Design a protein around this ligand. Structure first.
Ligand SMILES: Nc1ncnc2c1ncn2[C@@H]1O[C@H](COP(=O)(O)OP(=O)(O)OP(=O)(O)O)[C@@H](O)[C@H]1O
Ligand SMILES: CC(C)(O)c1coc(S(=O)(=O)NC(=O)Nc2c3c(cc4c2CCC4)C=CC3)c1
Lengths: 284, 816
């Protein structure tokens, strides 16, 4: 354990104590650690890019972190610091280990019970708020799915970006047949035509469906990438039950999951709808 | 050397001196703006009329647009009128805005073209105001557009030619949209008041609105209204005593329009020397009562009025001229009769048009039209257009139709209605309900609760009891007392509901009624009260009703309800006598060790038939396992126990295991998920697995057993008496080192059906090992997890090969 160095702030691992690993990406590892300077629990994202990029290629990764560090919102995981030492990239993030959306979904599956619409909007609207914040600053998420959706003990949603280090894996798309979860990807992402803001909307719609159905709209048994892509391109997926969810919810999903890349709603639209729906089913 | 702001403020003060907004105010009386009773305002602490446009809590984001919403009769327009006056008087926003422009939605065309002259039409008498001067400057002005839902004619949101530049004339819909979207005179402020139904076509135009709900009168305010309305306290007391006796009407009087109608009716009864009887129960009854009292003292003109009202709805007309009145056979004597009687207004505010005192009355008359003895007179077309903005949604037209179509008919003009038609309508309405009941809607026009309101109005048991057969699942979101009353009525008469979902909103220990009704239901099976503020006081009331002999509740869901340890006392009391309850979910509450200790009493108690108990995230520690373990030993009825997401470490589990181990325990499932367990606990688990043959599903996901834990657990699982079928091992901090033991398990055990391996470093070799060995006549039927794992090509190929070669493994699951 290195001695504490308060004068260097959060720009060294000497000021943090790792207690355990909490997750793993393909370009990075995620550790649970406490800050030795102030006792605050943090998430440490360790990125190993030195075996992939040289000093020049590495520069492409600067813009992404500098931009992400500008975010500031109660429903977004906060960035505190980033630095390089011991030939490793270290990013300090707000910790949200209380639980996540994935765990919530698994819980409902075990109970053989669907999530009440009033409980779907409860979390969905918060996610939408976080995305509005990002998009208004021209920041794309690019990996929206339950894995990155964290829920606090108080039921507050915080959107993280851990993913698989997608911000670094920008020029190695050949590996994305194995790296990534192409259930939340729009046809445009599948075709590698570029990721636009409306593609976050696609993935957001997918998430909403999944919560309501307790399963991805493009899920299937022993479904390969070929068939999966075809179902996505054809926007072919089962409807939500008419007596369990409102028409408005289904319409929101239908608008978000649109195989035509130019016909998706923006985040503001979706957020306003989520607010108006929530406002009618918002328990006090 | 004169300004315009002063001239306008004087004009505004002058025009808004009366609530009635006209002359001929019941004998040319003064409305008295002091008559105004404060309405409750709740921000999406109370919110004031002032500071509505103020910047928010962080980054000081300013508000240009404020949208108010509320039910018709609440006072959306009176609030705006009060606002106009308080400003003109220099008390409200007198520093913030130089001009306010109040525009009625019913007075603006959506079909004709014009420049933004609305700011001129609404200005002082001066026909040529300094519109191009300071009045032109955005942000110094606020527009007030009330009655968005009262807009007449079709309206679209998808307008390309939005049109800026107020000097340019364009179609009214475009002009309105441009104002709403803040494209025309941007940075100007805008206040909108609308019925919730019209939000469907408004929210798309707001961008970044602030929302406030307008609520009706409180009990105290209802009393004030009566005493302020009746200047003679002797009369006010009589009127107040009468409303107190008629509790149902009192509840409805939360809507100012309703209390006005009642007070107006009583005033007439007082003047006429009548007994002041008031026996109305429903909204329709109130409107019928009013019309009867006013007009009965006739049908020749009533029929004509009904025709006019119906035409106005279908032709989107609110303001009628003398030529329209003549077209319906209405002229001179009757028109006058309905001005001396407060049924119609003459729109004296710079207009020559006649209109209804309230839009609800227009809908009432239009509803009446269909039942008498000509836009249609058809009911099918009426119902088909129920969801259409373009027809005004027809909400009251249909709601009144339900109330009017009854077998319990009365006299006084009502004798004019045709029973033949009434019978035809009744049948059509039942078919309509069957259809609308099949597809939930929240903010459309049908809305589940709305159907209940319709059933409430039609106070006929045969009809309602039949209608209720189409609601196997009832989901409601109650707000006010009126909603609780209506819901109680509809549910009480329902004999075919299995699932009740109550999304209780806001404005606890008053609910009663509904719970009293639910406990007497014969078909209700599942009661879902999760994710709402059912704090202990509410749980206590519910528990009292849950002890009723006829409850018949099989499942009770009480998740994140904010319950504390105290509620377990009352729950225990239910368990001790309610022999019907099978599954109870108390997850996501603060039912710590003390709370559960109390629950254990109810669980141990004889005749407790509870089989499934969920205690996830209940702030429990290993300390409570001492009592819970006794429950497992003592209670033969409890078979499913989920206690994950608590502080139940290895010592907690060992306690539970010591008793669960006993082969006479009936425990079948253990939700020992995020318990923070290590390989140490596997000794205790092994003993249970090798002993208790009633255990079929064991959930250990979320723990950190490692390979050592797997080996120890396997020793138990590999025992010939282990009957475990499903094992869940999500991220258990496993490595490829454990694949040998898992491999051994896969080709050794016989009772195992599913091995769920989640996010752990099993390795590529681990999976390939599994593929080779699982082929050797495995007994496994289900998948092997392998989610959130990264595999190389050869590994993926080998896994896919397995999937194809051994189809008996219905599911295997690759992460790709
Ligand atoms: N806050 C209040 N204080 C005193 N009287 C009120 C109040 N609100 C409404 N009223 C009573 O109700 C009657 C009708 O009020 P009002 O016209 O505002 O209904 P409304 O639904 O708001 O009309 P609109 O739909 O166009 O907004 C008035 O004549 C008055 O007697
Ligand atoms: C879901 C819900 C509660 O029924 C609703 C919410 O909002 C609407 S509304 O837009 O159609 N307005 C009204 O119903 N007003 C209104 C009501 C009652 C009685 C009267 C009026 C108008 C004068 C007589 C009884 C409660 C609603 C309806």
């Amino acid at each position: 354990q290195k001695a504490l160095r308060p004068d260097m702030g959060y720009n060294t691992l000497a000021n943090f104590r790792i207690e355990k690993k909490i997750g793993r990406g393909q370009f990075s590892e995620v550790y649970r650690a406490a800050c030795l300077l102030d006792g605050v629990p943090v998430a440490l994202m360790m990125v190993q890019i030195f075996d992939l990029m040289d000093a020049k290629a590495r520069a492409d990764c600067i813009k992404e972190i500098d931009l992400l560090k500008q975010l500031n919102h109660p429903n977004v995981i906060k960035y505190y610091a980033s630095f390089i030492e011991d030939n490793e990239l270290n990013i300090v993030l707000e910790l949200a280990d209380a639980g996540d959306l994935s765990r919530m979904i698994k819980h409902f599956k075990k109970q053989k019970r669907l999530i009440p619409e009033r409980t779907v909007w409860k979390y969905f609207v918060q996610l939408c708020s976080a995305l509005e914040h990002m998009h208004s600053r021209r920041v794309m998420h690019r990996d929206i799915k339950p894995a990155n959706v964290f829920i606090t003990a108080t039921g507050v949603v915080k959107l993280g970006d851990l993913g698989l280090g997608r911000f670094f894996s920008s020029k190695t798309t050949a590996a994305h047949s194995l790296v990534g979860t192409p259930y939340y990807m729009s046809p445009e992402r599948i075709h590698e035509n570029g990721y636009n803001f409306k593609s976050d909307i696609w993935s957001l719609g997918c998430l909403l469906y999944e919560m309501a159905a307790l399963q991805s709209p493009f899920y299937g048994d022993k479904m390969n990438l070929y068939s999966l892509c075809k179902k996505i391109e054809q926007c072919d997926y089962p409807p939500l039950p008419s007596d369990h969810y409102s028409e408005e919810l289904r319409q929101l999903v239908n608008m978000c999951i649109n195989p035509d890349p130019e016909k998706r709603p923006d985040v503001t639209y979706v957020y306003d709808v989520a607010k108006r729906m929530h406002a009618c089913t918002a328990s006090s | 050397k004169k300004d315009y702001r002063k001239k306008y403020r004087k004009y505004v003060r002058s025009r808004f001196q009366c609530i009635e907004d006209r002359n001929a105010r019941l004998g040319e009386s003064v409305s008295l703006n002091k008559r105004y009773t404060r309405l409750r305002l709740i921000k999406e602490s109370p919110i004031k009329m002032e500071l509505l446009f103020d910047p928010d809590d962080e980054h000081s984001e300013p508000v240009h647009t404020v949208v108010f919403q509320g039910a018709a009769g609440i006072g959306k327009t009176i609030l705006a009128r009060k606002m106009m006056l308080d400003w003109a008087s220099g008390t409200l926003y007198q520093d913030r805005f130089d001009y306010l422009f109040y525009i009625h939605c019913r007075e603006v065309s959506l079909v004709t073209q014009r420049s933004l002259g609305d700011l001129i039409m609404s200005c002082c008498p001066d026909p040529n105001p300094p519109i191009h001067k300071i009045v032109r400057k955005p942000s110094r002005i606020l527009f007030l557009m009330d009655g968005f839902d009262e807009l007449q004619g079709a309206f679209d949101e998808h307008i390309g030619p939005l049109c800026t530049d107020w000097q340019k004339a364009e179609r009214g819909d475009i002009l309105l949209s441009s104002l709403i979207r803040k494209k025309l005179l941007p940075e100007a402020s805008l206040l909108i008041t609308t019925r919730p139904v019209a939000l469907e076509k408004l929210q798309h135009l707001l961008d970044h609105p602030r929302h406030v709900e307008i609520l009706g009168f409180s009990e105290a305010k209802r009393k004030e209204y009566f005493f302020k309305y009746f200047s003679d306290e002797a009369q006010a007391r009589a009127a107040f005593s009468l409303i107190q006796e008629n509790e149902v009407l009192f509840t409805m009087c939360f809507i100012p329009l309703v209390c006005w109608i009642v007070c107006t009716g009583l005033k007439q009864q007082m003047e006429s020397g009548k007994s002041l009887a008031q026996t109305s129960k429903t909204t329709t009854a109130v409107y019928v009562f009013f019309l009867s009292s006013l007009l009965q003292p006739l049908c020749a003109h009533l029929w004509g009025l009904c025709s006019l009202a119906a035409d106005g709805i279908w032709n989107q007309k609110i303001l009628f001229e003398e030529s329209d009145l003549r077209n319906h056979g209405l002229q001179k004597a009757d028109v006058s009769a309905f001005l001396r009687m407060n049924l119609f207004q003459k729109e004296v505010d710079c207009e020559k048009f006649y209109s209804f005192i309230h839009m609800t009355f227009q809908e009432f008359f239009a509803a009446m039209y269909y039942l008498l003895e000509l836009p249609s007179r058809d009911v099918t077309v009426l119902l088909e257009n129920y969801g259409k903005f373009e027809k005004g949604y027809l909400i009251f037209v249909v709601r009144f139709l339900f109330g009017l179509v009854n077998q319990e008919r009365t006299s006084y003009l009502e004798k004019k209605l045709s029973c033949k038609i009434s019978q035809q309508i009744r049948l059509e309405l039942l078919k309509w309900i069957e259809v609308k009941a099949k597809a939930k809607k929240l903010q459309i026009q049908p809305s589940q609760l709305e159907l209940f309101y319709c059933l409430y109005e039609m106070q006929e048991e045969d009809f309602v009891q039949r209608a209720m057969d189409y609601f196997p699942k009832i989901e409601i979101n109650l707000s006010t007392r009126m909603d609780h009353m209506v819901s109680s009525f509809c549910i009480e008469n329902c004999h075919r509901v299995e699932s009740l979902s109550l999304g209780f909103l806001h404005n606890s220990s008053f609910c009663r009624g509904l719970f009293s009704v639910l406990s007497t239901s014969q078909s209700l099976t599942e009661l879902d009260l999760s994710d709402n503020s059912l704090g202990d006081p509410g749980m206590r009331v519910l528990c009292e009703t849950l002890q009723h002999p006829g409850c018949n509740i099989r499942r009770l869901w009480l998740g994140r309800c904010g319950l504390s340890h105290e509620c377990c006392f009352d729950i225990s009391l239910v368990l001790s006598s309610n022999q019907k309850l099978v599954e109870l979910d108390l997850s996501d509450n603060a039912l710590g060790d003390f709370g559960i200790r109390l629950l254990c009493v109810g669980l141990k108690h004889l005749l407790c038939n509870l089989k499934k108990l969920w205690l996830v995230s209940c702030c429990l520690t290993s300390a409570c396992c001492q009592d819970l373990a006794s429950v497992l030993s003592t209670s033969h009825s409890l078979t499913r126990l989920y206690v994950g997401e608590n502080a139940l470490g290895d010592s907690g589990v060992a306690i539970l295991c010591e008793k669960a181990k006993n082969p006479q325990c009936n425990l079948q499932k253990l939700g020992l998920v995020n318990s923070g367990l290590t390989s140490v606990c596997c000794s205790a688990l092994s003993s249970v697995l090798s002993t208790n043959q009633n255990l079929t599903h064991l959930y250990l996901r979320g723990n950190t057993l490692g390979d050592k834990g797997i080996k120890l657990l396997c020793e138990g699982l590999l025992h010939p008496d282990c009957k475990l079928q499903v094992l869940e091992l999500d991220n258990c901090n496993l490595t490829s080192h454990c694949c040998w033991d898992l491999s051994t398990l896969l080709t050794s055990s016989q009772s195992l059906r599913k091995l769920s391996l989640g996010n752990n470093d099993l390795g590529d070799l681990g999976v390939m090992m599994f593929c080779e060995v699982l082929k050797q006549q495995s007994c496994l039927l289900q998948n092997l997890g392998l989610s959130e794992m990264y595999f190389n090509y050869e590994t993926k190929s080998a896994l896919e090969t397995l999937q194809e070669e051994k189809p008996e493994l219905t599911v295997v699951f690759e992460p790709s």
